[PDB]
Write a protein that binds this ligand. Structure first.
Ligand code: HEA
Ligand code: HEA
Ligand SMILES: CCCCCCCCCCCCCCCCCC(=O)O[C@@H](COC(=O)CCCCCCCCCCCCCCC)COP(=O)(O)OCC[N+](C)(C)C
Ligand SMILES: CCCCCCCCCCCCCCCCCC(=O)O[C@@H](COC(=O)CCCCCCCCCCCCCCC)COP(=O)(O)OC[C@H](O)CO
Ligand SMILES: CCCCCCCCCCCCCCCCCCCC(=O)O[C@H](COC(=O)CCCCCCCCCCCCCC)COP(=O)(O)OCCN
Ligand SMILES: CCCCCCCCCCCCCCCCCC(=O)OC[C@H](COP(=O)(O)O)OC(=O)CCCCCCCCCCCCCCCCC
Ligand SMILES: CCCCCCCCCCCCCCCCCC(=O)OC[C@H](COP(=O)(O)O)OC(=O)CCCCCCCCCCCCCCCCC
Ligand SMILES: [Cu+2]
Ligand SMILES: [Mg+2]
Lengths: 90, 78, 72, 266, 47, 74, 504, 51, 91
């Protein structure tokens, strides 16, 4: 994970991961439903934002050019990281 | 919130000028001739004439030479 | 029941079509479904005509009212 | 109903810390109550019969709907619908409302400063006008200043205290010191040697002090409503902090009002 | 076990505060609005 | 022929000239009280306020003086 | 029940839009009487009743300023679009958002009811004393109470907007990633909170002068103090009504150019500089009231500085269209028409800002032409640009493209041939707020009255543009409202979307 | 009491109207200024107002 | 026992018992600086109230007792005005 200092404890991290999504090793995005809107910035320009829709049971998907790949996973609970695992502090 | 772009300081120079002009204008009004709550202010004619002529001259004496030269336009229309 | 604090706080747990709606606006995929109101285009044109008639006829009535007061 | 809480947990509560409301009828009733009270106020200005009664009827309807709305807000605050971020949203909203009221007071004191500094020929260029006796600063207004500063410090006591008895006593002390401000303002309004129709001095004095006194009354009622919720559960949340902020705002407004009108003779 | 009869936010008071007022005040504002409209329109000011 | 009007008073610099009217009207009656009735300076003040003040303003000021509602010392 | 008891921001925004359309219909109807009376010299359909003409222009100006543009931009598009755009699940105070709407039909009813009482409130939309005080009866009090209720509506809405922006943003989204529409609405809310209570104080002073025999603006008071307070409100008011139009133009131009906005931080600094300079130049409405020359000197020199940020915004819009892949539809034309015709209205403001030139054209139809350029080409074009752009997302109905271009061209022809001759009338010296003029002013008044009929016919054709919509499935977008279905669900953003920064 | 300093270059008849809204008959308060030479003004016109 | 406020409670920690009492004492010093003396003088003022009298009649200057409309919405005299002081005779 990234340093959790100066982060709100209820932000559901995975967005604070130390991993760049590749085709062979994507970032798994948890979801409470079969589809979920996320937002990816442009790696060469922070001011540019692209919103996309991930679907369950689909191949890895890239949103911006030279950006990460993402896979949705349907879960019952999403870890509200800031008190879920840094309280575990394993 | 962000990095102030090279434009924003060029904007901020006349904005600071306008704010300073506004503050100086609001400040000089309680040091003016008609802002006196008495009739006995005008019975000293030397001091009142001096104060009101000083209220005339400031910010107008910069323009006297070009008022006399009729520099009332950007171009020179006769 | 029916006046408890939970009814105040979480509303009434109604499910399905409300009274005369043909679509679930609260929990369905669309909060406005104008292709499911029966005879929608008659009602839309009647409502737009009424809105046009009132919005163009209120100042005319106020002109007629003020001038009927002088002419007396 | 039993599954409505279940539905709220499954779909709104467990996803984000923000509060989603069911449908409510009080804004529509409050708007039409303002309409009725405005018609009544217009009739009461020009001495129509049964106009003041209509204005009081509309204002009573507005006050009743506002109390019902605030009771619903307190009920929702007691079923634990408001997380910490919702309470910070409450504090930020009170800050914005306070800024609006402060600009209203700045507009009110603008007129006092303009009229007092340059007396016109209609007043024979004398301020204050002859016949008007100004209210001094070395008398009962100074007692009001001391009392309201004490109310400021007592409301500051209740903000940091953790003992419930000390909090309730400090709240009651600030409410009682606020009620002593108003009953003394009533005596100023009765003993004064000028009316609201006597010169722009009387006009500006009475309009500005009346708005300030109405804000003192509203802040005292807000602090009183905050105390009874603390009396029951020993927990107030955003009701205590917003009310203490509003009371501090009233105390800050009084400083400008006193310094402009009572000291500056404007 | 957390509510008294002296309590303003009692659940037994919710019908009176929320259901009865929603129709009583709803008809009172209609009656006040019609009378205020007639009073301002068809009334004569004495001041 | 030459026409004589009220001179420019340096004490009154603004575009609103009501105070010049009022002060000249008051200086006339101060001159009338102090230096007699037929002094040249009093006639100067009289022609000065007559040249500036509207007639309605002046007649309102003598009815306020006659009713006793003039705040001047004299 | 649904439309009476609502707490959803999307229902409240739609109610604001329908209300603003009703107010626009009322002000269109009141404006055909103005142009039908002024078509020919002499006495027209008003039978020489000047008080009724003053009532008509007062009600028309107040309605079009306060019950059309603000309920369409600030209340209609802002409430529908802001929580979806920043990712908030709802507003911060959902029931305050319903009373912010429901104080507007009472204010409209009071204003329309003041016309049927006595001889009506013929004072102008500015309502200057002692003309407003001299009016005997009830109509002026109903008008001022209507303004009070609308100001309370605006203050409540601004508080809700400012708390919704600051505290319900999506996770990971800072004050750099919000669209320029959000920044415009936030700055408009700040302006409303700082400006409306000064108007409320001035109106309370007006009621105490009228009905309590007080001494604010009277024999022993000062009447210039009213103009000071009212225009200290009123110059921020015209920037309140144009900033959401700037936001809508930015969103429309960036969409169909297939490009992001040029100079985002410059755009935000320009909107902030416009918001800040709008509070220190109010007295350019008071050049002819007899202020001292130093005050007039400052208010002349500080008014023209507003040209620089607006020019920066216009040039950045042109740079956004520059080097793009542009497709011209009906919202794209209303934005191009905005940028072309707002520039024409802005340059006459620079002329009016110069005080010596303003001594010749004050209270003439030159001023009328200026502010109908910056309001009928600036705000009305911005409103109609958003109606065709977001309409299938908001209402669930599409629009016929050919009839929308017919409506755009009828409107563009009508409003240009209406207010462009009024420049020549105002330069020649035709004064404002008059229903009869000199014989030589007949030609341009006939031309302008011909143009107003084309504008009215354009208003008629707009009701025929609506048709059934086609619905598809979204995948990606650059803003959050275009990955949603048309129409969205009642709880849009069923899961809260987050913004993830790319890793190393 | 707002003062204006004015000096006219040429003789003629100059027209005007009132330019502040003031009631039902705001349209019907026109202004006409007649300008003549100073010697005519001081030898003929001012003799109409000597009592 | 499954409320939203308790559900999100561990994610919003309180910012960190005798320091509270120290702060109460610090604020109560300023409270007692101006508290008892103002209450004592106000209770004195409540007993020296409507007993003094003024007989200074005011001449009816044009800026006194403005009556642009006849009377007031409640009556003839001002509100809270037991004894008008402006001359109604004038003489
Ligand atoms: C928003 C501001 C606005 C708009 C749009 C207009 C629109 C028009 N106005 Fe006016 N006008 C004013 C603001 C406006 N006006 C003000 C403030 C005054 C001053 C009054 C006073 O001095 O007291 C004034 C006064 C005024 C005068 C001067 C009168 C006088 O001095 O005596 C004239 C003269 O021709 C005029 C004519 C017109 C015409 C022909 C239109 C045409 O454009 C007709 C309108 C056509 C439209 C297309 C606009 C309607 C918009 C919609 C319908 C969009 C809403 C739709 C949705 C929300 C979906 N109006
Ligand atoms: C939409 C509302 C709106 C907007 C945006 C504006 C914008 C401006 N206005 Fe105006 N105005 C009104 C609405 C508006 N106004 C109304 C309703 C009235 C009459 C009130 C009444 O009823 O009495 C009025 C009246 C009014 C007056 C009072 C004059 C009088 O009535 O006697 C003045 C004086 O300074 C003024 C000036 C300006 C200026 C300088 C701008 C500037 O913000 C415009 C700046 C824009 C540009 C200048 C063009 C873009 C810039 C460039 C392309 C760069 C190049 C430019 C240069 C190099 C100079 N307008
Ligand atoms: C009266 C004194 C109070 C100050 C005031 O308003 O006096 C004027 C006096 O100025 C004049 O108009 C000159 C006449 C003297 C100051 O300038 P204004 O025209 O009002 O604009 C400045 C803004 N502000 C109100 C915030 C001070
Ligand atoms: C009569 C109108 C009363 C309005 C009360 C009000 O403004 O309070 C709101 C909050 O207001 C503020 O934030 C402060 C502004 C107060 C404005 C008071 C109006 C005074 C008018 C003069 C309450 O928010 P809500 O009703 O949307 O419920 C929120 C819920 O409890 C949890 O989300
Ligand atoms: C909607 C916007 C609000 C519009 C309605 C405003 C109506 C104002 C009503 C004022 C009625 C009371 C006026 C009045 O004379 O009372 C004064 C109290 O001041 C006050 O209380 C004046 C402030 C009023 C704020 C409301 C003191 O009375 P006085 O000056 O005659 O007493 C002097 C004799 N000792
Ligand atoms: C009256 C106001 C007219 C001015 C405003 C213009 C917009 C409204 C009229 C447009 C009608 C239209 O497009 O129809 C074509 C429209 C379809 O045209 P198409 O798309 O070209 O086939 O016709 C219909 O949909 C017919 C539906 C039934 C028509 C009769 C019942 C409704 C009448 C409403 C018209 C107003 C009547 C007068 C007032 C009655 C009380 C409100
Ligand atoms: C001046 C009027 C100011 C009214 C301020 C109302 C704030 C509403 C609020 O914070 O709601 C949440 C708030 C919840 O706070 P909690 O106790 O932390 O849940 O709702 C309330 O019930 C606040 C208390 C309302 C008290 C009545 C207002 C009395 C004002 C004078 C009349
Ligand atoms: Cu302006
Ligand atoms: Mg004017």
């Amino acid at each position: 994970y990234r340093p959790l200092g100066d982060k709100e404890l209820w932000h559901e991290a995975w967005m604070y991961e130390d991993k760049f999504g590749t085709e062979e090793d994507p970032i798994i995005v948890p979801s409470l439903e079969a589809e979920r809107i996320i937002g990816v910035t442009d790696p060469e320009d922070e001011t540019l934002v692209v919103w996309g829709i991930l679907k369950d049971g689909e191949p890895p998907r890239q949103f911006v050019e030279n950006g990460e790949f993402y896979v949705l996973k349907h879960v019952e609970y999403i870890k509200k990281v800031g008190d879920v695992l840094e309280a575990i502090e394993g | 919130p962000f990095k102030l772009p090279l434009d924003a300081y060029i904007l901020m120079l006349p904005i600071t000028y306008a704010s300073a002009a506004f503050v100086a204008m609001c400040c000089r009004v309680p040091t003016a001739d008609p802002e006196t709550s008495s009739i006995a202010y005008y019975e000293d004619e030397q001091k009142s004439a001096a104060a009101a002529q000083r209220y005339d001259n400031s910010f107008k004496q910069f323009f006297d030479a070009r008022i006399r030269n009729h520099k009332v336009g950007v171009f020179q229309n006769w | 029941e029916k006046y408890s604090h939970e009814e105040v706080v979480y509303g009434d747990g109604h499910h399905g079509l409300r009274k005369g709606y043909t679509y679930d606006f609260e929990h369905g995929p669309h909060y406005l479904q104008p292709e499911k109101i029966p005879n929608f285009w008659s009602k839309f044109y009647a409502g737009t005509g009424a809105l046009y008639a009132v919005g163009l006829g209120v100042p005319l009535f106020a002109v007629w009212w003020q001038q009927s007061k002088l002419k007396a | 109903h039993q599954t409505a809480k279940e539905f709220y947990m499954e779909h709104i509560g467990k996803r984000h810390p923000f509060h989603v409301l069911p449908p409510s009828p009080w804004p529509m009733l409050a708007g039409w109550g303002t309409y009725v009270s405005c018609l009544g106020m217009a009739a009461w200005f020009h001495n129509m019969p049964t106009g003041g009664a209509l204005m009081a009827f509309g204002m009573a309807n507005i006050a009743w709907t506002a109390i019902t709305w605030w009771r619903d807000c307190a009920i929702e605050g007691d079923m634990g619908m408001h997380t910490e971020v919702v309470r910070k949203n409450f504090i930020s909203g009170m800050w914005a409302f306070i800024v609006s009221e402060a600009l209203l007071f700045v507009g009110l004191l603008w007129a006092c400063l303009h009229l007092g500094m340059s007396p016109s020929v209609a007043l024979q260029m004398q301020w204050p006008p002859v016949g008007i006796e100004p209210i001094g600063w070395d008398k009962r207004a100074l007692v009001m200043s001391a009392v309201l500063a004490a109310s400021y410090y007592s409301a500051n006591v209740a903000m940091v205290a953790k003992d419930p008895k000390v909090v309730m006593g400090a709240l009651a002390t600030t409410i009682g010191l606020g009620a002593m401000f108003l009953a003394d303002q009533y005596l100023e309004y009765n003993e004064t040697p000028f009316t609201i129709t006597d010169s722009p001095y009387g006009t500006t004095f009475f309009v500005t002090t009346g708005f300030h006194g109405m804000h003192v009354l509203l802040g005292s009622l807000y602090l009183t409503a905050a105390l009874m919720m603390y009396k029951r559960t020993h927990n107030a949340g955003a009701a205590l902090k917003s009310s203490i902020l509003y009371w501090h705002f009233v105390d800050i407004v009084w400083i400008a009002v006193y310094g402009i009108i009572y000291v500056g003779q404007y | 076990d957390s509510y008294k009869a002296t309590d303003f936010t009692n659940p037994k008071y919710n019908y009176f505060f929320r259901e009865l007022t929603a129709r009583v005040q709803g008809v009172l504002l209609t009656g006040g609005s019609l009378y205020g409209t007639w009073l301002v329109v068809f009334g004569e000011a004495q001041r | 022929p030459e026409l004589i009007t009220a001179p420019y008073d340096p004490r009154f610099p603004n575009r609103n000239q009501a105070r010049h009217c009022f002060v000249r009207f008051n200086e006339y009656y101060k001159c009338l009280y102090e230096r007699g009735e037929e002094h040249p300076r009093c006639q100067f003040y009289q022609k000065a306020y007559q040249s500036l003040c509207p007639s309605e303003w002046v007649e309102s000021w003598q009815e306020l003086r006659e009713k006793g509602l003039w705040t001047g010392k004299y | 029940m649904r439309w009476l008891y609502s707490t959803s921001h999307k229902d409240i925004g739609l109610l604001y839009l329908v209300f603003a359309f009703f107010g626009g219909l009322l002000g269109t109807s009141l404006s055909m009487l103005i142009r039908y009376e002024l078509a020919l010299p002499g006495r027209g359909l008003l039978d020489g009743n000047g008080q009724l003409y003053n009532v008509i222009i007062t009600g028309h100006g107040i309605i079009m300023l306060l019950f059309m543009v603000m309920p369409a931009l600030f209340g209609g598009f802002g409430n529908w679009l802001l929580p979806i755009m920043i990712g908030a699940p709802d507003m911060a105070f959902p029931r305050l958002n319903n009373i912010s709407f429901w104080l507007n039909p009472p204010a409209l009813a009071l204003l329309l009811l003041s016309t049927l009482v006595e001889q009506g409130p013929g004072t102008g939309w500015t309502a200057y004393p002692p003309l407003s005080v001299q009016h005997s009866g009830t109509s002026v009090d109903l008008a001022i109470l209507s303004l009070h209720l609308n100001g309370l509506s605006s203050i409540l809405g601004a508080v809700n907007m400012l708390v919704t922006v600051a505290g319900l943003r999506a996770p990971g989204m800072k004050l750099l990633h919000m669209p320029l529409f959000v920044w415009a609405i936030a700055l408009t809310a700040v302006l409303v909170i700082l400006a409306v209570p000064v108007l409320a104080a001035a109106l309370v002073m007006l009621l105490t002068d009228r009905n309590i025999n007080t001494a604010y603006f009277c024999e022993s008071g000062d009447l210039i103090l009213y103009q000071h307070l009212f225009w200290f409100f009123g110059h921020p008011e015209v920037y309140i009504l144009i900033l959401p139009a700037f936001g809508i133009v930015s969103q429309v131009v960036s969409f169909f150019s297939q490009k992001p906005v040029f100079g985002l931080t410059g755009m935000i600094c320009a909107m902030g500089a416009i918001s800040l300079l709008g509070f220190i130049v109010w007295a350019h409405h008071m050049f002819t009231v007899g202020l001292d020359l130093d005050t007039v000197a400052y208010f002349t020199s500080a008014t023209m500085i507003i040209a620089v940020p607006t020019g920066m915004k216009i040039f950045s819009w042109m740079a956004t269209i520059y080097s793009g892949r542009v497709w011209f539809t009906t919202p794209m034309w209303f934005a191009v028409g905005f940028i072309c015709l707002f520039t024409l209205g802005g340059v006459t403001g620079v002329v009016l800002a110069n005080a010596g030139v303003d001594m010749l054209v004050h209270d003439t139809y030159y001023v009328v032409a200026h502010f109908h350029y910056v309001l009928s080409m600036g705000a009305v074009f911005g409103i109609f640009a958003g109606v065709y752009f977001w309409g299938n997302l908001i209402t669930g109905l599409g629009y016929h493209e050919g009839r929308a271009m017919v409506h755009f061209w009828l409107l563009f022809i009508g409003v240009n041939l209406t207010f462009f001759p009024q420049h020549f009338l105002g330069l020649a010296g035709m004064p404002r707020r008059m229903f009869d003029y000199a014989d030589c002013f007949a030609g341009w008044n006939a031309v302008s009255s011909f143009g107003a009929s084309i504008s009215f016919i354009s208003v008629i054709v707009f009701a025929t543009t609506f048709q059934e919509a086609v619905r598809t499935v979204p995948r990606t977008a650059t803003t959050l409202e275009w990955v949603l279905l048309a129409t969205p669900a009642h709880h849009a953003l069923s899961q809260v979307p987050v913004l993830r920064t790319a890793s190393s | 009491l707002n003062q204006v300093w004015m000096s006219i270059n040429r003789e003629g008849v100059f027209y005007g109207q009132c330019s502040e809204l003031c009631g039902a008959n705001h349209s019907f308060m026109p202004i006409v200024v007649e300008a003549i030479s100073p010697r005519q003004f001081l030898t003929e016109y001012v003799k109409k107002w000597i009592s | 026992g499954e409320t939203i406020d308790k559900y999100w409670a561990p994610y919003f920690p309180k910012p960190a018992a005798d320091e509270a009492k120290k702060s109460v004492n610090k604020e109560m010093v300023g409270f007692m600086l101006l508290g008892p003396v103002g209450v004592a003088f106000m209770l004195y003022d409540f007993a020296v109230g409507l007993e003094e009298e003024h007989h200074v009649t005011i001449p009816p200057y044009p800026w006194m007792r403005i009556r642009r409309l006849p009377g007031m919405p409640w009556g003839q005299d001002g509100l809270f005005e037991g004894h008008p002081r402006v001359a109604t005779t004038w003489p």
